[PDB]
Design a protein around this ligand. Structure first.
Ligand code: SF4
Length: 277
């Protein structure tokens, strides 16, 4: 009987879904089952799945994302700095989608991912918040590295998104592209150029994962995290997390040492884990 992906009618998952799954897996599950409850604007517009230019078909929305990538790649390779870079790729049988906030080259020529976290109150981030945030930026590197190394193909995206390449691209898509100097023929031709540009433009793997916490008003830095990426640990975690989404195990609540997370959880009054873990 249905897996959570089928039950919640999810064709793919967002990077933040797995980040909040690190906070509480049951809370993330309830967030998909009961969505009626529950700034980087491109990532926020991706979570509600809005898009940059008029949003009719899903082939149009993905075509816009592909045109953005084709422009951001040479911008990064010449200006050394870009923002809001879309990432996607199949991870353990599930397509993962996200938006990297900032990519730039350090003075030593290292490709650095920057993740800025603003806070209302000038308080240090919790250990549980840093665990989750470190997992999020590690996922960005996991997907990005696979993208620029040729491990993410147009076929894999079509399989999960059910994009139709027979449907021609809308005028708002073709207008956005021609105004950028590029003439898209078909969605299939666009996807093939994205693959080429991702893999043949000398894009290195991400060298630095940097998280910065800032108090908004005073601009005071509340901490800086240089994430120690270990790909074997990262893969083990997504394997475990995707095992729930694909339906191979039951969702888990928080550990008893972190029962304080339930104090401000929307679904505390219906969670059976909160009663008997
Ligand atoms: S009440 Fe606690 S265990 Fe249950 S979903 Fe919320 S955070 Fe998770």
């Amino acid at each position: 009987i249905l897996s959570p992906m089928e039950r919640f009618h999810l064709k793919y998952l967002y990077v933040t879904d797995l980040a909040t799954q690190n906070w509480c897996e049951l809370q993330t599950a309830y967030g998909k089952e009961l969505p009626g409850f529950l700034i980087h604007l491109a990532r926020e517009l991706e979570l509600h799945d809005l898009v940059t230019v008029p949003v009719t078909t899903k082939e149009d929305a993905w075509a816009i994302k592909f045109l953005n990538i084709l422009l951001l790649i040479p911008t990064l390779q010449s200006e050394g700095h870009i923002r809001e870079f879309p990432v996607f790729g199949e991870v353990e049988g599930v397509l993962l989608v996200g938006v990297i906030d900032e990519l730039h080259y350090t003075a030593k020529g290292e490709l650095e991912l920057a993740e800025l976290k603003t806070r209302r109150r000038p308080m240090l981030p919790l250990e549980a918040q840093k665990k989750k945030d470190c997992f999020q930026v590690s996922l960005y590197k996991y997907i990005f590295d696979a993208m620029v190394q040729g491990k993410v193909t147009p076929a894999s995206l079509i399989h999960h998104t059910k994009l139709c390449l027979e449907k021609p691209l809308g005028p708002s898509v073709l207008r956005h592209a021609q105004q950028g100097g590029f003439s898209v023929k078909s969605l299939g031709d666009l996807m093939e150029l994205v693959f080429l540009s991702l893999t043949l433009s000398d894009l290195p793997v991400i060298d630095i994962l940097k998280i910065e916490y800032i108090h908004q008003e005073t601009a005071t830095v509340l901490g800086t995290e240089i994430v120690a990426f270990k790909e074997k640990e990262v893969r083990a975690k997504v394997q475990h997390y995707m095992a729930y989404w694909m339906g191979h195990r039951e969702p888990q609540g928080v550990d008893v040492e972190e029962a304080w997370k339930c104090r401000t959880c929307t679904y505390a009054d219906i969670c059976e884990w909160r009663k008997g873990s």
